[PDB]
């Protein structure tokens, strides 16, 4: 259940289905991985980083992403840019779903 | 004012402000470029390819993206994966905005 080139996935908000939907990869290839992370309200991910640059898009709900020098409160439609190796943590304020795109080096 | 690491841009639907908003890069860095393409209804981009893989997310409206072996009709929330060097064309069905993420090789 992964997209190949030319294929499509819907990242619309899950809404009432959020609580029944696990996080899943849309696709993973040599240079890129795209995943939908589903976080229930309160879920935390400790400080960490990835070697390539990445983007986190808040599809619904509210999530706090701690970064060097700030705590970014993302709401629906917010797209956060993380440079290569930029440390960050995640705190789901509400039930939320995130589209996470990671460049692999 | 492109995003630096840890910064946020809204990719919410433009709605009534769509036809007044030009396409713009959210950021451009060594390994990754993220742009919002704003296409008025009927606008076409001819068949072309980029060297790295990419994703095209339909933020609002409807767009037809031609790919090898198919014509994908994307609606809001649809995310298309394009492999490295995958030829594609774009036809805005309605006024639409697209989040385009491109891995740079």
UniProtKB/TrEMBL annotation, chains A, B:
Where does the Cupin type-2 domain start and stop, copy by copy?
Answer: 36-103
Which InterPro entries does the UniProt entry name for this protein? Cupin_2 (IPR013096), RmlC-like_jellyroll (IPR014710), RmlC_Cupin_sf (IPR011051)
Judging by the UniProt lineage, the source's domain of life is: Bacteria
**Entry protein name:** Cupin region
- Organism name: Cupriavidus pinatubonensis (strain JMP 134 / LMG 1197) (Cupriavidus necator (strain JMP 134))
């Amino acid at each position: 259940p992964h997209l190949s080139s030319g294929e499509v996935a819907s990242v619309l908000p899950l809404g009432k289905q959020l609580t029944q939907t696990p996080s899943a990869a849309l696709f993973k290839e040599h240079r890129l991985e795209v995943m939908r992370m589903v976080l229930p309200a309160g879920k935390q991910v400790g400080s960490h980083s990835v070697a390539g640059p990445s983007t986190i898009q808040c599809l619904e709900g509210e999530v706090e992403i701690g970064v060097d020098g700030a705590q970014r409160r993302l709401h629906q439609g917010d797209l956060l840019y993380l440079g290569a190796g930029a440390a960050h943590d995640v705190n789901a304020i509400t039930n939320t779903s995130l589209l996470v795109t990671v460049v692999l080096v």
